[PDB]
């Protein structure tokens, strides 16, 4: 429970196909907690409980890049998965997936 | 031009200077008038939301 999230997770028991040589299954969840709020964990079993959480303040929204390219130090403003771009000219043909101005 | 006393090329100044000015304004307008903000065109979706 929290100020905006609330859900009761009833455990289920069944025989699942073997994945990574393990019979069981586990559904992972996440939620956000506002400043000055309260989160609650009440259960009698079948619950894995957080040890370390994370704190943040989100800055608008960016993208996620999947590639096989090494990383070095730069100051760039466009980021294709296969390199960077001058962005001094208004048209590029490197990759449709880009992040930045 | 060629005359009795000399010859050679002599480029005009003012007309091509104005030409350079207008062409640099032209390329500046073509390049810079397109303004672009931060964006993330890469989106990810799962199997149940094709």
């Amino acid at each position: 429970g929290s100020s905006r999230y609330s859900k009761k997770f009833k455990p289920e028991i069944a025989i699942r196909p073997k994945v990574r040589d393990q019979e069981g299954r586990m559904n992972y969840y996440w939620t956000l907690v506002e400043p000055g709020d309260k989160i609650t964990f009440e259960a009698t079993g079948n619950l894995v409980v957080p040890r370390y959480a994370f704190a943040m303040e989100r800055n608008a929204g960016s993208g996620i890049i999947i590639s096989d390219t090494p990383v070095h130090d730069c100051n760039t403003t466009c980021q294709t998965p296969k390199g960077a771009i001058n962005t001094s000219l208004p048209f590029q043909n490197i990759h449709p997936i880009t992040i930045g101005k | 031009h060629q005359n009795e006393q000399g010859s050679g090329y002599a480029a005009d100044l003012k007309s091509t200077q104005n030409a350079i000015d207008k062409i640099t304004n032209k390329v500046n307008s073509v390049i810079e008038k397109m303004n672009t903000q931060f964006t993330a065109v890469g989106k990810e979706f799962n199997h149940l939301e094709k």
Partner: antibody
Framework: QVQLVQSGGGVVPPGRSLRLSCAASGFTFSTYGMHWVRQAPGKGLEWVAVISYDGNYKYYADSVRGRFTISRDNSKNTLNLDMNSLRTEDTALYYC??????????????????????WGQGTLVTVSS | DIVMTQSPDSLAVSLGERATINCRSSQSVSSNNKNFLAWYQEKPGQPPKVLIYWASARESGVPDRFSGSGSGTDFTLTISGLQAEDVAVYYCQQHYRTPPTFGQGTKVEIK
């Protein structure tokens, strides 16, 4: 914020190369031309060299033509000045400047440059034995 | 190329009055109703900063007391109410030909 810092100067006897680098940051470097300008001690300023935004076309003054080599690396936002064939008169205080006309095109040897927006802090070069 | 001369050189006035320096170019610099001249000012130990660009405008951060005008081959820089922190050297600079040429320079200082 526009910033222009340069270094690498010092004392040099005539006849050996000297190289200067004017790193730039805080502004769009690759879309502007740059200049070289010097201050002879006890005299006034005078122009040295100019390089355009794409780096294809370069120009020099009538005093250092055929001896200097202005160069640029937009990948590092670094302006460079190869500097050879020295003489005693060449002692001065070197500044790197930025032109005002955005993305100016220089195609011939008489065109109209922009005015100098911002200047480097200045480094000393002198010619002595 | 083009050479210019600032006739008052090392002129000295005290605080509050008017300081006028002219600038006569060898040939015409202005084109299509636009002034291709800039002024520069340097203090001891500082790089020469821009003071007035296009001979009529003003660089942001320059005090309003600095004003200039002129047309054709003659241009003037005028100081309204000189301050003691403005002792410096002034320059002309025509950016019309590929060799931009600076003037010989003038000095302003206390009387």
């Amino acid at each position: 914020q526009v910033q222009l810092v340069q270094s690498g100067g010092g004392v040099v006897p005539p006849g050996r190369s000297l190289r200067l680098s004017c790193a730039a940051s805080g502004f769009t470097f690759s879309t502007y031309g740059m200049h070289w300008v010097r201050q002879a001690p006890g005299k006034g300023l005078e122009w040295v060299a100019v390089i355009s935004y794409d780096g294809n076309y370069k120009y020099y003054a009538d005093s250092v033509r055929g001896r200097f080599t202005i160069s640029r690396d937009n990948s590092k936002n670094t302006l460079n000045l190869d500097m050879n064939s020295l003489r005693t008169e060449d002692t001065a205080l070197y500044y790197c400047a930025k032109d005002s006309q955005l993305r100016s095109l220089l195609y011939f040897d008489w065109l109209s440059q922009g005015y100098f927006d911002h200047w480097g802090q200045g480094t000393l070069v002198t010619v002595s034995s | 190329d083009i050479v210019m001369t600032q006739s008052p050189d090392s002129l000295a006035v005290s605080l509050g009055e008017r300081a006028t320096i002219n600038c006569r170019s060898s040939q015409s610099v202005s084109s299509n109703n636009k002034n291709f001249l800039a002024w520069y000012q340097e203090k001891p130990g500082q790089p020469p900063k821009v003071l007035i660009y296009w001979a009529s405008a003003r660089e942001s951060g320059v005090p309003d007391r600095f004003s200039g005008s002129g047309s054709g081959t003659d241009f003037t820089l005028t100081i309204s109410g000189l301050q003691a922190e403005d002792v410096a050297v002034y320059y002309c600079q025509q950016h019309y030909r590929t060799p931009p040429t600076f003037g010989q320079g003038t000095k302003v200082e206390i009387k």
